[PDB]
Design a protein around this nucleic acid. Structure first.
Ligand SMILES: [Zn+2]
Ligand SMILES: [Zn+2]
Ligand SMILES: [Zn+2]
Ligand SMILES: [Zn+2]
Lengths: 620, 187, 586
RNA sequence: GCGGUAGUAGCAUGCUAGGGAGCAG
RNA sequence: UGACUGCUCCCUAGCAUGCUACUACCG
């Protein structure tokens, strides 16, 4: 916290990898042997050799990934399009990358129009499209990192919030795992800079034996390996005409982070009934269970949800270090105090203050999260609970203590000041008590910076529990954004569900003999997903009828809506799947004398294959 | 099945039973006509249900061993591509201007952000508009990073050569504007 | 782990172990060479051995398959499978199988422990690939026999030309002479530091090399055995007689350096390969210089095998040839640097087999083929493959340093493939014009093997002296001595003024070093001293056994001197087949 | 009259792998 | 050029279990 403030006095060219000249069989190389963090100060690698002869595989992967050799053999760069610090230009030309429009499925649009859709003055319009971009799109999206400003925190308050936050993560287990216990899905995805030139992640997961991976992982508990991140534009449907970019981190980072965090990140995704609902499904009654767990036993309940403006770009650098220290609290037997620092500096050097590749040039990231790191959705949920617990501390400590009529919420306000500003060590009897007070009067459900709260509505009006106005003050001094109270909602009647969670609306239907909660989408999102696609995909529906069975599953709970213009989106998808099947079994009978049997195909235009996805007693 | 070591018994028992059908067979020899190809047939089926398992097992190592070969051949093609890089990005270090800052260093460690800034030969400047151009790159020479650079080429976004006279105050609306100036170090 | 069966070349994946170098025996061919010999181990993409708990059962022939590992009988899972069966060891590519009836040689070559001449006779009657494999395994067994030596630990040094060296316990002193160049590598703390090219004299100690190192504490003297690379390209190619001269440009004028060279161009330019069969001192050093200048429009190269024999090719090069027009190569082993170094584009390239650049050519010369093993020809053909080449040398010289064969003598023909292929189909040429040499050698080599095809040129003035002294030989330790040699040399120079400015020949360097310690004479090599013979020389007895002087060792040693040749009899050597002068000893 | 044992064919469930596709943050 | 996770539908190949008829020996 002090280094954050003192590092704004020193030149910005002194922060980053510290390089030195080594010799590998009589030739001079420049390699990184340390780091200078604005927060953690100067760190020096522990195993550096100046005179070597032969480089192994595990010693070439650590020399190719380092930015020390790429940014010491390229041209100087002065980029006036952006205000971020710029390091080098790796080639002689600047790359300008654009985004193409979408493809039009004219058959589906004709079919929909011939069935009374898209009339003038209709409730359902088209609002989700494929937006095109010009060559000034990647740098204009990178330049949104000017919203990350140095932020000193209140340390006596944060050192208590971090202890109420590590109680939402007590029901899990975690630790380090060997290279033969690591689970990887879709090995056919990129592998970063210096490597996307030679293959995908499969090549590097096959070329490396288990012992090579173990040696690489144990190398980073004593050394620091900086890497390069590549910014990639996205090609997807949306409602805003702004570009979306993701960060593809390197393979030396992902490979070694998956052995550090994956045992805990898969026990979070396996717990049902907790605050973090990552892993739970919306199908087979899951959305009813999730909504009846958050409702718990609160009293006078109201529902609330808020927004995080510019969440990844504006998040401070001290609430991102605090999320890696809560996830690493599970490694308390497997790793030592010194092994858990070099696995923290290794995270900062790779996903917090790294060097990014935008075009053909290297820039310096000021701070903020990277979508592409392993623990993202899981580190975004630690930050979401930390900002909602400090809103409840600021709401109770700024309340006139003479007007509190209750006597339990008057000594709980008198011991919280002591625990914050008059104590120096952890008191594990008021933390367990504040954590129960919150769970009783302020119940949350969190999914990676999406949150829904059921709260006492006669305590938030008196001032003993956080409100929407208490989230607008915490985001102003702790997050450097202004949260307008027109992106947050509130709900008084609990028989209508949350207004929105995970882009889905809620509705109470009658199913069987009992009333349940069902999620339904935005009709313009499901309609606009059949009209606009990516060629050969759905510019011919017969070559993929599975796209429309997976889009009628999402459109099913629209049949229960009181609006009859919403309930027609499901019957339009069941009538098109039959059209695409009569054609297919009738196009292979007039050009090739083939006769297909319609047995076990009629289930996809009947409203009983889709009704079984929203009823308990799971199958498959 | 022509080499299973239990075909002889089966073959003989078939011949004894089947071929001797026309000949008058009493109710006592019929047992031999019946319980001789039986049991032998059971054993043969046992000798064929194990052969079928040995074959499949075998044809699961003559496929898992092509894959161990494939990968090692591949491991030797990437191990020789990173090597051919880290030795081509090295013959490019003007080792007179680089051994002059690693030497003035206290221990030989220097920040990496000052190596291209003080030991590079070429500069690339990317300029958005005309106003930025006259405050950064006016004339044929300009100073930046405590040095003096002399302009060598001005390409544009389309990558077509621009001249330093097309860049006016009023001809500016007629150029693809992200302009890229390439300059060389002086003295 | 997939390649050419040494024999069939089809793609295999196997490879024995017995075979130190580990060739890629095919599938089938393993069944022969695996059962038909102690050779049992086998390594394919994965190694074959009872993976069962710390076992130790191998001979695949017995090991069985199963599961996904292997198990002999050790603990063969219920679903086993013989690894070995129907003439084939289970291995990748099984239908491209073939094998070939060639385990014949293959088995003798594999089993040959290299102790008798029969090893070389059977090694030299096979096919091309078998020849390559045999040469490779011979060089392998010899270097791995030669590296069986310890280290020399040195901590202090008194002064120059003196050193107290002591070998390890149980390891004998490495051999005296310089045929094994002492390329040592000491240690400082972690790695190998350079020492320099060295050579020992005796157990005073004169350093006959050109270097100076700061030897002192912690010095470790070692013998460096280079890891030999596998040979790929063939050693030769069958020829074919053409009619059209392609590319070659005969000169408008006549470079009348020699007279008989016109027949050399007429006979050599036609066929795809030949050999300059020239008697000693009959133009075996500068005919290629004439071919270089008679064909200036043809790319011409020269390779050598020894650093010493660079005198004749250098003196006339400075006398009548330029400097820039030629080219030389030397890495940073050591040699003259007069000419241009690192020039891949030139017309007169001099190089040595240690290191050559990958390039093709059209005419090459290869000096001292008789010193060179088949591996040397194969490596100089693989590193530099050219259209035509001529092997300077003659089979009637000394054998190569094959210290592996002792009891049996080495006949010419079995020196290499060329030294017999040129005997069977006939020699391509024969010369008899000695530039600077009396006719004593002419008569000797005409009576011995030439059958008197070339006749005396210079008058036999009967100036050669031969006596009837035999001498006595005695062995005491690893180094040998000869008591009737310290006095015999003195007794022979008692009253002869002519040889007061003469040189000394050293068949055995130990006796020469001892005599130089007693009296003092310059040391001269016997093997790597062809073309460097001094005008006035003395031949010493120096030996009484069949180790070196049996038939083919004196033919080049009795022609060193030009005018005064004093060659005393040393053994039953041709004594009673001709006449000879004799100065009566006092 | 029945039970056990070893093959063979046929119908569903769960799990482990590969392939294509849909949605969410 | 194509990141990290989670859920879910459809198709093919292999493994074990669950009610049957067929074999055949054995009771
Ligand atoms: Zn750990
Ligand atoms: Zn072998
Ligand atoms: Zn065993
Ligand atoms: Zn073969």
């Amino acid at each position: 916290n002090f280094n954050v403030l003192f590092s704004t006095v020193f030149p910005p060219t002194s922060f980053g990898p510290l390089v030195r000249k080594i010799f590998v069989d009589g030739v001079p190389f420049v390699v990184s042997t340390g780091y200078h963090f604005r927060e953690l100060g100067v760190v020096h690698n522990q195993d550096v050799n100046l005179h070597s002869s032969r480089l192994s595989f595990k010693e070439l992967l650590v020399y190719a990934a380092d930015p020390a050799m790429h940014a010491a053999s390229g041209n100087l760069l002065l980029d006036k399009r952006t205000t971020c610090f710029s390091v080098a230009a790796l080639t002689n030309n600047v790359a300008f990358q654009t985004v193409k429009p979408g493809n039009f499925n004219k058959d589906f649009y004709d079919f929909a129009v011939s069935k009374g859709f898209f009339k003038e003055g209709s409730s359902v319009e088209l609002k989700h499209f494929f937006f095109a971009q010009d060559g000034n799109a990647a740098i204009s999206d990178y330049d949104y990192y000017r919203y990350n400003l140095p932020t000193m925190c209140d340390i006596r308050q944060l050192l208590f919030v971090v202890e109420v936050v590590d109680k939402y993560f007590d029901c899990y287990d975690g630790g380090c795992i060997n290279a033969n216990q690591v689970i990887v899905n879709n090995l056919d995805k990129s592998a970063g800079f210096p490597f996307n030139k030679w293959g995908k992640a499969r090549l590097y997961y096959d070329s490396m034996s288990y012992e090579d991976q173990d040696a690489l992982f144990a190398y980073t508990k004593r050394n620091v390996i900086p890497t390069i991140t590549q910014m990639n534009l996205k090609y997807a449907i949306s409602a805003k005409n702004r570009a979306r970019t993701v960060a593809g981190v390197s393979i030396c980072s992902t490979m070694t982070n998956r052995q550090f965090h994956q045992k805990l990140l898969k026990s979070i995704a396996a717990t049902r009934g907790a605050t973090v609902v990552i892993g739970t499904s919306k199908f087979y009654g899951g959305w009813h269970n999730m909504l009846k767990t958050v409702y718990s036993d609160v009293e006078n309940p109201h529902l609330m949800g808020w927004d995080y403006p510019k969440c990844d770009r504006a998040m401070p650098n001290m609430l991102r270090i605090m999320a890696s220290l809560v996830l690493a609290r599970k490694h308390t037997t497997c790793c030592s105090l010194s092994h858990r620092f070099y696995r923290l500096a290794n995270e900062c050097a790779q996903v917090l203050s790294e060097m990014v590749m935008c075009g053909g040039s290297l820039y310096v990231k000021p701070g903020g999260t990277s979508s592409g790191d392993a623990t993202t959705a899981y580190a975004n949920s630690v930050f979401n609970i930390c900002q909602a617990v400090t809103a409840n501390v600021n709401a109770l400590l700024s309340t006139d203590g003479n007007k509190i009529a209750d006597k339990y919420v008057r000594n709980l306000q008198h011991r919280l000041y002591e625990c914050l500003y008059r104590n120096r060590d952890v008191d594990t009897d008021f933390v367990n008590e504040f954590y129960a007070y919150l769970r009783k009067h302020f119940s949350m459900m969190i999914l990676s910076d999406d949150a829904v709260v059921c709260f006492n509505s006669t305590y938030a009006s008196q001032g003993l529990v956080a409100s929407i106005k208490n989230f607008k003050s915490v985001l102003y001094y702790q997050n450097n954004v202004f949260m307008s109270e027109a992106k947050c909602w509130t709900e008084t009647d609990l028989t209508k569900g949350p207004h929105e969670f995970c882009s889905q609306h809620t509705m109470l239907v009658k199913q069987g003999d009992d009333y349940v909660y069902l999620p339904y989408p935005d009709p313009s999102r499901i309609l606009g997903a059949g009209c606009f696609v990516d060629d050969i995909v759905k510019t011919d529906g017969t070559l993929m009828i599975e796209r429309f069975v997976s889009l009628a599953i999402d459109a099913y709970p629209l049949t229960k809506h009181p609006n009859q213009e919403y309930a027609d989106v499901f019957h339009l998808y069941l009538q098109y799947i039959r059209k695409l099947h009569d054609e297919l079994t009738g196009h292979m009978l007039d050009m090739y004398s083939v006769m297909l049997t319609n047995d076990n195909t009629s289930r996809y235009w009947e409203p009983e294959f889709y009704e079984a996805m929203y009823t308990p007693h799971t199958v498959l | 099945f022509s080499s299973l070591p239990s075909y002889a018994a089966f073959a003989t028992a078939q011949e004894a039973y089947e071929q001797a059908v026309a000949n008058g067979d009493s109710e006592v020899v019929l047992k031999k006509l019946k319980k001789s190809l039986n049991v032998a047939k059971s054993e043969f089926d046992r000798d064929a249900a194990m052969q079928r398992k040995l074959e499949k097992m075998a044809d699961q190592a003559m496929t898992q061993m092509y894959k161990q070969a494939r990968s090692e051949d591949k491991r030797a093609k990437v191990t020789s591509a990173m090597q051919t890089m880290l030795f081509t990005m090295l013959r490019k270090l003007d080792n007179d201007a680089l051994n002059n800052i690693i030497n003035n260093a206290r221990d030989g460690c220097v920040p990496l952000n000052i190596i291209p800034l003080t030991t590079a030969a070429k500069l690339m400047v990317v300029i958005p508009d005309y106003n930025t151009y006259k405050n950064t790159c006016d004339g044929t020479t300009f100073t930046y990073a405590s040095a003096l650079w002399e302009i060598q080429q001005v390409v544009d976004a389309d990558s077509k050569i621009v001249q330093l006279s097309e860049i006016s105050m009023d001809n500016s609306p007629n150029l693809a504007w992200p302009l890229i100036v390439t300059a060389l170090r002086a003295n | 782990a997939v390649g050419a069966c040494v024999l069939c070349n089809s793609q295999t994946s196997l490879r024995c172990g017995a075979c130190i170098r580990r060739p890629f025996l095919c599938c089938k061919c393993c069944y022969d060479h695996v059962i038909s010999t102690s050779h049992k181990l086998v390594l394919s993409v994965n190694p074959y051995v009872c993976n069962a708990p710390g076992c130790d059962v191998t001979d695949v022939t017995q090991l069985y398959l199963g599961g996904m590992s292997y198990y002999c009988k050790s603990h063969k899972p219920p679903i086993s499978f013989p690894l070995c069966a129907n003439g084939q060891v289970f291995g990748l590519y099984k239908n491209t199988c073939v094998g070939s009836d060639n385990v014949t040689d293959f088995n003798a070559i594999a089993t040959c422990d290299w102790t008798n001449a029969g090893d070389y006779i059977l090694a030299n009657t096979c096919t091309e690939r078998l020849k390559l494999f045999a040469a490779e395994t011979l060089k392998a067994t010899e270097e791995t026999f030669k590296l069986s030596y310890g280290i020399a630990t040195v901590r202090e040094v008194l002064s120059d030309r003196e050193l107290h060296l002591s070998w390890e316990v149980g390891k004998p002193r490495p051999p005296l002479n310089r045929n094994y160049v002492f390329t040592g590598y000491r240690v400082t703390k972690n790695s190998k530091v350079q020492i320099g090219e060295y050579t020992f004299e005796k157990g005073a100690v004169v350093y006959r090399g050109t270097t100076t190192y700061k030897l002192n504490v912690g010095d470790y003297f070692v013998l460096t055995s280079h890891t030999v690379m596998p040979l790929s390209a063939p050693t030769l190619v069958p020829q074919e007689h053409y009619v059209r001269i392609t590319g070659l440009y005969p000169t408008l004028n006549i470079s009348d350096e020699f007279s008989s060279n016109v027949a050399n161009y007429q006979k050599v330019g036609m066929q795809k390969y030949s050999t300059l069969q020239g008697p000693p001192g009959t133009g075996k050093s500068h005919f290629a210089i004439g071919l270089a200048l008679y064909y200036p429009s043809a790319r011409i190269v020269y390779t050598a095998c020894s650093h010493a024999a660079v005198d004749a090719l250098c003196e006339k090069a400075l006398k009548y040839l330029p400097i820039d027009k030629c080219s030389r190569i030397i890495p940073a082993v050591e040699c003259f640097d007069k000419f241009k170094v690192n020039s891949t584009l030139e017309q007169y390239v001099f190089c040595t087999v240690n290191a050559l650049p990958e390039t093709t050519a059209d005419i090459v010369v290869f000096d001292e083929i008789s010193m060179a093993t088949n591996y040397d020809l194969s490596v100089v053909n693989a590193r530099l493959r050219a259209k035509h080449y001529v092997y300077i040398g003659d089979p009637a010289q000394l054998p190569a340093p094959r210290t592996l064969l002792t009891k049996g003598t080495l006949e010419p023909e079995y020196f290499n493939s060329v030294c017999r292929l040129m005997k069977t189909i006939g020699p391509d040429m024969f010369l008899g014009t000695c530039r600077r040499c009396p006719a004593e050698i002419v008569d000797t080599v005409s009576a011995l093997v030439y059958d008197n095809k070339l006749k005396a040129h210079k008058d036999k003035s009967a100036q050669c002296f031969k006596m009837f002294y035999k001498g006595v030989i005695t062995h005491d330790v690893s180094s040998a001595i000869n008591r009737p040699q310290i006095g015999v040399v003195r007794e022979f120079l008692t009253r002869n003024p002519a040889w007061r400015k003469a040189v000394f020949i050293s068949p055995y360097n130990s006796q020469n070093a001892v005599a130089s310690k007693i009296l003092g004479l310059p040391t001269q090599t016997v093997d790597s001293s062809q073309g460097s013979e001094y005008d006035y020389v003395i031949f010493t007895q120096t030996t009484e056994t069949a180790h070196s002087c049996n038939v083919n060792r004196f033919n080049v040693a009795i022609t060193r001197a030009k005018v005064g040749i004093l060659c005393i009899m040393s053994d039953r050597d041709l004594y009673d087949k001709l006449q000879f002068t004799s100065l009566e000893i006092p």
